[PDB]
Design an enzyme around this catalytic site. Structure first.
Site, PDB file in Angstrom:
ATOM      1  N   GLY A 146       0.796  -1.219   0.000  1.00 27.25           N
ATOM      2  CA  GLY A 146       0.000   0.000   0.000  1.00 27.25           C
ATOM      3  C   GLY A 146       0.830   1.270   0.000  1.00 27.25           C
ATOM      4  N   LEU A 252     -12.865  15.195 -12.648  1.00 21.50           N
ATOM      5  CA  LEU A 252     -11.926  15.030 -11.543  1.00 21.50           C
ATOM      6  C   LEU A 252     -11.205  16.333 -11.226  1.00 21.50           C
ATOM      7  CD1 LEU A 252     -10.172  11.566 -12.163  1.00 21.50           C
ATOM      8  CD2 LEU A 252     -11.832  12.154 -10.385  1.00 21.50           C
ATOM      9  N   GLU A 254     -12.488  19.189 -11.034  1.00 23.04           N
ATOM     10  CA  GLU A 254     -13.307  20.019 -10.155  1.00 23.04           C
ATOM     11  C   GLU A 254     -13.016  19.750  -8.686  1.00 23.04           C
ATOM     12  OE1 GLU A 254     -16.952  20.820 -12.204  1.00 23.04           O
ATOM     13  OE2 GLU A 254     -18.008  21.133 -10.309  1.00 23.04           O
TER      14      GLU A 254
HETATM   15  N1  LIG Z   1     -10.183   0.109   6.600  1.00 23.86           N
HETATM   16  C1  LIG Z   1      -9.429  -0.934   6.264  1.00 23.86           C
HETATM   17  N2  LIG Z   1      -8.103  -0.958   6.640  1.00 23.86           N
HETATM   18  C2  LIG Z   1      -7.326  -2.015   6.302  1.00 23.86           C
HETATM   19  C3  LIG Z   1      -7.841  -3.081   5.581  1.00 23.86           C
HETATM   20  N3  LIG Z   1      -6.851  -3.981   5.392  1.00 23.86           N
HETATM   21  C4  LIG Z   1      -5.726  -3.503   5.975  1.00 23.86           C
HETATM   22  N4  LIG Z   1      -6.013  -2.295   6.557  1.00 23.86           N
HETATM   23  C5  LIG Z   1      -5.085  -1.402   7.267  1.00 23.86           C
HETATM   24  O1  LIG Z   1      -3.962  -1.281   6.425  1.00 23.86           O
HETATM   25  C6  LIG Z   1      -2.756  -1.288   7.145  1.00 23.86           C
HETATM   26  C7  LIG Z   1      -1.834  -2.308   6.494  1.00 23.86           C
HETATM   27  O2  LIG Z   1      -2.028  -2.245   5.101  1.00 23.86           O
HETATM   28  P1  LIG Z   1      -2.253  -3.567   4.214  1.00 23.86           P
HETATM   29  O3  LIG Z   1      -3.228  -3.288   3.091  1.00 23.86           O
HETATM   30  O4  LIG Z   1      -2.704  -4.724   5.077  1.00 23.86           O
HETATM   31  O5  LIG Z   1      -0.776  -3.854   3.649  1.00 23.86           O
HETATM   32  P2  LIG Z   1      -0.483  -4.385   2.162  1.00 23.86           P
HETATM   33  O6  LIG Z   1      -0.901  -3.349   1.153  1.00 23.86           O
HETATM   34  O7  LIG Z   1      -1.182  -5.698   1.909  1.00 23.86           O
HETATM   35  O8  LIG Z   1       1.125  -4.497   2.120  1.00 23.86           O
HETATM   36  P3  LIG Z   1       1.940  -5.831   2.525  1.00 23.86           P
HETATM   37  O9  LIG Z   1       2.760  -5.546   3.762  1.00 23.86           O
HETATM   38  O10 LIG Z   1       2.852  -6.187   1.378  1.00 23.86           O
HETATM   39  O11 LIG Z   1       1.005  -6.988   2.785  1.00 23.86           O
HETATM   40  C8  LIG Z   1      -3.100  -1.634   8.578  1.00 23.86           C
HETATM   41  O12 LIG Z   1      -2.851  -0.497   9.372  1.00 23.86           O
HETATM   42  C9  LIG Z   1      -4.581  -1.948   8.588  1.00 23.86           C
HETATM   43  O13 LIG Z   1      -5.190  -1.277   9.665  1.00 23.86           O
HETATM   44  C10 LIG Z   1      -9.175  -3.061   5.201  1.00 23.86           C
HETATM   45  O14 LIG Z   1      -9.647  -3.998   4.561  1.00 23.86           O
HETATM   46  N5  LIG Z   1      -9.966  -1.985   5.544  1.00 23.86           N
END
Ligand SMILES: Nc1nc2c(ncn2[C@@H]2O[C@H](COP(=O)(O)OP(=O)(O)OP(=O)(O)O)[C@@H](O)[C@H]2O)c(=O)[nH]1
Ligand SMILES: COc1cc(C(=O)c2cnc(-c3c[nH]c4cccc(C)c34)[nH]2)cc(OC)c1OC
Ligand SMILES: Nc1nc2c(ncn2[C@@H]2O[C@H](COP(=O)(O)OP(=O)(O)O)[C@@H](O)[C@H]2O)c(=O)[nH]1
Ligand SMILES: [Ca+2]
Ligand SMILES: [Mg+2]
Ligand SMILES: [Mg+2]
EC number: 3.6.5.-
Lengths: 437, 427, 332, 54
Positions: A146, A252, A254
């Site tokens: 992420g 977008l 806007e």
């Molecule tokens: N709101 C919400 N938050 C999420 C969700 N999944 C993970 N998180 C949050 O995202 C953060 C971690 O990000 P992830 O998406 O799990 O990490 P990733 O993108 O899979 O990256 P990797 O480490 O490679 O697995 C944590 O702080 C979680 O609280 C979700 O489905 N909904």
């Protein structure tokens, strides 16, 4: 019509995309098999819902979406889930081993190996676009994918699509659902690298979504499914203008025009009301003045902060349901007298309003109750900077001891990139400081 | 995400065998490797520790290693010996004689390539190998010396995989030979450089738990191994069963290990239980939390109150109110904030698993990166120098080609490891 | 057990509260930067309000109200009164005031009016009778000072022709209950009053330390309420409540209910209380004026024991329960 | 106060009420940072495989 391509990166992006696209389908009357009876233009159209769905001669409506995770577990659930027939598999992109909560692993090590593949699969969607306006990027701050791969992808879209706008839906990290002790590192590293490449970013603090689910939905221990179905309503409120007929926020561009007067300060605060439980069937329907008033209670904000101790630069109200402008202006006049709404001296103290009469839709058997009217306020207030200070403090605590820095250097990153990113964040807090006092 | 398990030596194979007993029973696998279970949750992540053989039989992804055939012959005749792949038995004949130099330099060298061949054969068939786990002791020769030789060689061939060890620390309370401080000090020097996570299982603590808390007057190695097989089932719960964290060996090291050398964890288990004797009064979650942070349940004879926790990972098994777990975990952090470092925020992590271990309705496993673990290495370093400054028993090693220098070096690197743990204790 | 941190060590008051809190066996003090606190005795410079209320399973309370500086900073106090239609037009209890920036029109626009009406044209920052003696004087400082009328007709205790001011201590809790401490203090000038040539420094500007004489009539120049009421009773045929206190309670209520919608923590993620210190002056018409508000106050050595306890009873233990009154609830 | 720019549709409407008036890097440079970290990855690994050679 101008198409928008949604990109979901990592677990949080993928699962929220599921939440949003399931809701988008229910709003537009599209079935899990892609069929949309109400659509008479078969195999084509320049309607507003085509901003998010393209069409096949067979009558299927397919999201203009791409899903990317460096690990197959989450997207394989999309491949086998209720909406498996919605996406064609070239849109679902998986690696074999994730970035292990590491920004440096997600950006450099594993990201470099798959960035060109993703951009190629994105180009396949752009070549079905007669006029592409930009991208909606869903990711987390905390995960390695992420944070690490998104900043890589965002750098590249500025190169391949230079003039196209890019909006972010970012999940700000919260201990109540925290996956890693280094999430402050990943958050600062990604925000620094992405800042120049994002035009508007809606931060959603998981701590806010947690408490809202606990207070208003009476869920003692909320799940990701609980959190994401709430978020999808907020995301739906923000994208609705792009998918429906209307005058406010149609392109977008806007969003940045109405919400972002200063480029770096492009993190609007989202506030949403009413959140009412589906189990509580005895209910009392909230008026326009009641739901507008809730937009200034911090308990309904997507980030916990105190707008009273900050200045506004822009404020939009996105109503959905049974609303008329007369009741809106009356509610505003009442609230303006009773709340601390200071604007900067260089911006008008006005409110931009949009109304969609189709009331908010709910997932059958969900936790959200069907309401008669809802509102989503988007305010660009300096008070959101509280979240940066919180994040930067935790960063400063660990980095003073260089704790966990070796996992990042071990991927090719340099210790100096930590200091670059923290200085940028330190400047960002000062930029918010000048505007707010 | 598959793991390759390696057990070396007497102690290595005994706690190794019991481990496979315990988790096979938890996953509903029989001595013949056939699944007779009642929940598909038993199978969801069975590939991590088990290969799928023909006829849908399950074979531990396990390699058995020893320099004498005695202990491994006993495993094959043991309760589950038939479940192991016969090609994965790799033994020598002359044995290592409780001598690190024999396992590491001479007798082990003849056998080490035969093991790595079996390792390669198992890794090649893995969808996506995440790493290795080694069970061994540090006081003997085969597990102590040859085990750390395999680790160095596995790092050579798999330099981007995780190396996990369950390493049994020696104690005069449970002592086979006077040279055990020499063997452990030489093994610790290797573990510092070539492992990512090491569970310090101190025989001193296992004895005290058997003697004092469990009221076992004269405990056997089988009583200590009962505690070890329960701890190992605990620390492997999130690997073997599905959860929220998407758990793997790398993420554990990323979050547990702030500095690469400080990767020596104190395990803990609750409740503490003797063999055969069953407990009928199940525990309250306040009781689980209170015990698992109590020094009496620590598998390394260190007082966590004599240091500070860098990171903590707690895993609860059983049907229980996770809100009560969060409330209770937050309670001990807030009541004992001085024993957690303030410069690593949110450094306690809690996972839950619905499936309990055979015997108990709810359990709790504790994993801690405490700076009080230096107390264990100080113990070894004292016992070491008591002999070494008279060069006592050193002929056993020089005869195998080693030098006094290699001892002096290992003494210093461990003393360094102690001072680093003290560096961050006084922050 | 409850937990707290201490981040203002020069706090004469909350030094005592942490002493009383520890001396209960139910409160432990952590290190300043430990985030897992139930309560914070925060600082006065850049109190990190943004980091409060984000610890899971922790109800956090703090002894300061974010935004009360606008009541405790003179330049903003003045700006608060001229603008708020809750206090406008001319609240009959605040001295006509003006803010002056050093290198403005309205200050002169009425200065003429009080020499061309031959009226009382004395002002205050330090004091003077001519404008140039302060405008040029403020330009000498660099810090922005306020300027306002100097009350030339003070009430004077007898014997001694003694000029004084009144300090009442006010406690607001997380519920925005306004608690006025029943025990106030009069800081009387121990030296008689000059009325014409005011270039004399400390002959009339009463400060507890500027008189450095100081400790003559009654110990510490401090006459408590039981005596000031009796003096008025015997020397003026009235009571402290009627002549003075009804107005003090009016001004406190007025000032605090003004900024209430801006600092309230009714629905916040952290709660807040704060002890304030109001400074008043009384003229010869028995008319109470507002000098200044002090958001970081200090008590008198005779009353620390009683006040610093009432803070624990009604402002701390009301959020963190354990296992007659000295305050006067100003209803609103 | 002042309601302006009202556009009505069948799905809803929009307007703007005012209360008072006022008072990128190159693909080339990307690889010169991307590839420069795959090398540090390999320099560190070489020093490891060298240390294992000793
Ligand atoms: N709101 C919400 N938050 C999420 C969700 N999944 C993970 N998180 C949050 O995202 C953060 C971690 O990000 P992830 O998406 O799990 O990490 P990733 O993108 O899979 O990256 P990797 O480490 O490679 O697995 C944590 O702080 C979680 O609280 C979700 O489905 N909904
Ligand atoms: C809860 O125990 C474990 C966790 C993990 C795991 O994958 C993990 C991912 N993220 C974290 C953490 C996030 N914040 C923390 C703070 C302190 C300690 C930890 C471990 C974390 N753990 C893996 C485990 O076995 C491989 C494990 O043992 C049973
Ligand atoms: N807990 C436990 N410790 C053991 C066991 N067997 C041996 N040890 C310990 O391991 C050390 C002896 O090493 P050993 O494994 O017998 O020698 P090796 O065959 O060369 O590896 C001594 O300190 C013993 O206390 C066992 O079954 N359980
Ligand atoms: Ca169509
Ligand atoms: Mg992932
Ligand atoms: Mg032995």
């Amino acid at each position: 019509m101008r198409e928008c391509i949604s990109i979901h990166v990592g677990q949080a992006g993928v699962q929220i995309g599921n939440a949003c696209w399931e809701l988008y389908c229910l709003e537009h009357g599209i079935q899990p098999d892609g069929q949309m009876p109400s659509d008479k233009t078969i195999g084509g159209g320049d309607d507003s819902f085509n901003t998010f769905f393209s069409e096949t001669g067979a009558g299927k409506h397919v999201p203009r979406a791409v899903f990317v995770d460096l690990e197959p577990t989450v997207i394989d659930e999309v491949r086998t889930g209720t909406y498996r027939q919605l996406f064609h598999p070239e849109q679902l992109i998986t690696g074999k081993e994730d970035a292990a909560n590491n920004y440096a692993r997600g950006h450099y090590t594993i990201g470099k190996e798959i960035i060109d593949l993703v951009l190629d699969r994105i180009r396949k969607l752009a070549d079905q676009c007669t006029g592409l306006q930009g991208f909606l990027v869903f990711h987390s701050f905390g995960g390695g994918t992420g944070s690490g791969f998104t900043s890589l992808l965002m750098e590249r879209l500025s190169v391949d699509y230079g003039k196209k706008s890019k909006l972010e839906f970012s999940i700000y990290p919260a201990p109540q659902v925290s996956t890693a002790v280094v999430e402050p590192y990943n958050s600062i590293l990604t925000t620094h690298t992405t800042l120049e490449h994002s035009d508007c970013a809606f931060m959603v603090d998981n701590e806010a979504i947690y408490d809202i689910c606990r207070r208003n939905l009476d869920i003692e221990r909320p799940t990701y499914t609980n959190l994401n179905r709430l978020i999808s309503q907020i995301v739906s409120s923000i994208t609705a203008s792009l998918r429906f007929d209307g005058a406010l926020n149609v392109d977008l561009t806007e969003f940045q025009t109405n919400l972002v007067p200063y480029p770096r300060i492009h993190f609007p605060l989202a506030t949403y009301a009413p959140v009412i439980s589906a189990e509580k069937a005895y209910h009392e329907q909230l008026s326009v003045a009641e739901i507008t008033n809730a937009c200034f209670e911090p308990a309904n904000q997507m980030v916990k902060c105190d707008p009273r101790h900050g200045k506004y630069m822009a404020c939009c109200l996105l109503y959905r349901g049974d609303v008329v402008p007369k009741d809106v202006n009356a509610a505003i006049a009442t609230i303006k007298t009773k709340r601390s709404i200071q604007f900067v001296d260089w911006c008008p103290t006005g409110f931009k309003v949009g109304i969609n009469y189709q009331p908010p839709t709910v997932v059958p058997g969900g936790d959200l109750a069907k309401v008669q009217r809802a509102v989503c306020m988007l305010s660009n207030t300096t008070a959101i900077a509280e979240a940066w200070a919180r994040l930067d403090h935790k960063f400063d605590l660990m980095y003073a001891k260089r704790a966990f820095v070796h996992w990042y250097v071990g991927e090719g990153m340099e210790e100096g990139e930590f200091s670059e990113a923290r200085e940028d964040m330190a400047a960002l807090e000062k930029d918010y400081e000048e505007v707010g006092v | 995400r598959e793991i390759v398990h390696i057990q070396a030596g007497q102690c290595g194979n005994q706690i190794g065998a019991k481990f496979w007993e315990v988790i096979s029973d938890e996953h509903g696998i029989d001595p013949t490797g056939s699944y007779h279970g009642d929940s598909d949750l038993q199978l969801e992540r069975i590939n991590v520790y088990y290969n799928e053989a023909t006829g849908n039989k399950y074979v531990p992804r396990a390699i058995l290693v020893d320099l004498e055939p005695g202990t491994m012959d006993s495993v094959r005749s043991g309760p589950f010996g038939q479940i192991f792949r016969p090609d994965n038995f790799v033994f020598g004949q002359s044995g290592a004689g409780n001598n690190w130099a024999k396992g590491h330099y001479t007798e082990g060298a003849e056998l080490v390539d035969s093991v790595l061949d079996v390792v390669r054969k198992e890794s090649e068939s893995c969808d996506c190998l995440q790493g290795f786990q080694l069970t061994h002791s540090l006081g003997g020769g085969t597990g102590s010396g040859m085990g750390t030789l395999l680790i160095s060689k596995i790092r050579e061939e798999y330099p981007d995989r995780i190396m996990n060890t369950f390493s049994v620390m020696p104690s005069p309370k449970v002592s086979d030979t006077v040279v055990e401080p020499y063997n452990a000090t030489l093994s610790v020097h290797q573990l510092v450089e070539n492992t990512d996570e090491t569970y310090c299982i101190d025989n001193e603590a296992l004895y005290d738990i058997c003697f004092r808390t469990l009221k076992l007057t004269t405990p056997t190695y089988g009583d200590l191994n009962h505690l070890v097989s329960a701890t190992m089932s605990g620390v492997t719960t999130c690997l073997r069963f599905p959860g929220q964290l998407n758990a793997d060996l790398r993420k554990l090291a990323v979050n547990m290990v702030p500095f690469p050398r400080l990767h020596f964890f104190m395990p803990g288990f609750a409740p503490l239980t003797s063999r055969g004797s069953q407990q009928y009064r199940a525990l309250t979650v306040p009781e689980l939390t209170q015990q698992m942070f109590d020094s009496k349940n620590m598998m390394a004879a260190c007082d966590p109150r004599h240091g500070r926790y860098l990171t903590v990972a707690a895993i609860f098994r059983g049907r229980m109110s996770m809100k009560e777990v969060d409330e209770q975990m937050l309670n001990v952090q807030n009541k004992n904030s001085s024993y957690f470092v303030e410069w690593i925020p949110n450094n306690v992590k809690t996972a839950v698993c619905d499936i309990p271990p055979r015997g108990l309705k709810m359990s709790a496993t504790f994993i801690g990166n405490s700076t009080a673990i230096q107390e264990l290495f100080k113990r070894i370093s004292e016992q070491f120098t008591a002999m070494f400054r008279r060069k006592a028993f050193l002929h056993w090693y020089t005869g195998e080609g080693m030098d006094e220098m290699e001892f002096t070096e290992a003494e210093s690197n461990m003393n360094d490891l102690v001072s680093e743990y003290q560096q961050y204790q006084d922050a | 057990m409850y937990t707290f941190v201490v981040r203002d060590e020069n706090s004469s008051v909350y030094a005592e509260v942490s002493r009383l809190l520890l001396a209960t066996g139910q409160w432990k003090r952590l290190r300043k930067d430990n985030p897992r606190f139930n309560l914070m005795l925060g600082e006065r410079n850049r109190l990190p309000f943004g980091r409060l209320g984000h610890e899971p399973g922790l109800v956090q309370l703090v002894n300061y109200y974010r935004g009360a500086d606008k009541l405790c900073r003179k330049a903003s106090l003045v700006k608060l009164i001229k603008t708020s239609p809750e206090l406008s037009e001319s609240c009959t209890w605040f001295p006509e005031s003006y803010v002056i920036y050093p290198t403005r029109e309205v200050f002169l626009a009425a200065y003429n009016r009080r020499r061309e009406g031959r009226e009382g044209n004395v002002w205050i920052a330090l004091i003077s009778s001519e404008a140039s003696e302060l405008l040029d004087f403020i330009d000498e400082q660099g810090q922005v000072h306020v300027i306002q009328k100097y009350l030339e007709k003070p009430l004077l205790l007898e014997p001694g022709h003694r000029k004084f001011d009144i300090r009442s201590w006010v406690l607001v809790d997380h519920l925005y209950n306004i608690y006025l401490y029943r025990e106030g203090v009069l800081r009387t000038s121990s030296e008689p009053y000059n009325s014409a040539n005011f270039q004399d420094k400390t002959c009339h500007l009463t400060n507890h330390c500027i008189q450095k004489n100081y400790g003559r009539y009654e110990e510490g120049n401090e006459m408590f309420f039981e005596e000031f009421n009796q003096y008025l009773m015997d020397a003026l045929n009235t009571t402290l409540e009627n002549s003075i206190l009804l107005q003090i309670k009016h001004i406190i209520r007025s000032c605090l209910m003004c900024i209430e919608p801006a600092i309230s923590t009714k629905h916040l993620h952290y709660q807040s209380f704060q002890l304030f210190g109001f400074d008043f002056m009384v003229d010869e018409e028995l008319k109470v004026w507002l000098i200044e508000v002090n958001g970081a106050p200090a008590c008198a050595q005779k009353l620390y024991a009683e006040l610093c306890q009432g803070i624990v009873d009604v402002a701390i233990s009301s959020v963190f329960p354990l296992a007659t009154s000295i305050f006067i609830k100003l209803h609103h | 106060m002042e309601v302006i720019e009202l556009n009505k549709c069948t799905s809803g409407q929009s307007f703007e009420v005012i209360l008072k008036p006022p008072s990128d890097p190159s693909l080339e440079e990307i690889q010169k940072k991307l590839e420069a970290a795959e090398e540090r990855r390999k320099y560190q690994e070489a020093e490891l495989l060298k240390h294992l050679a000793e």
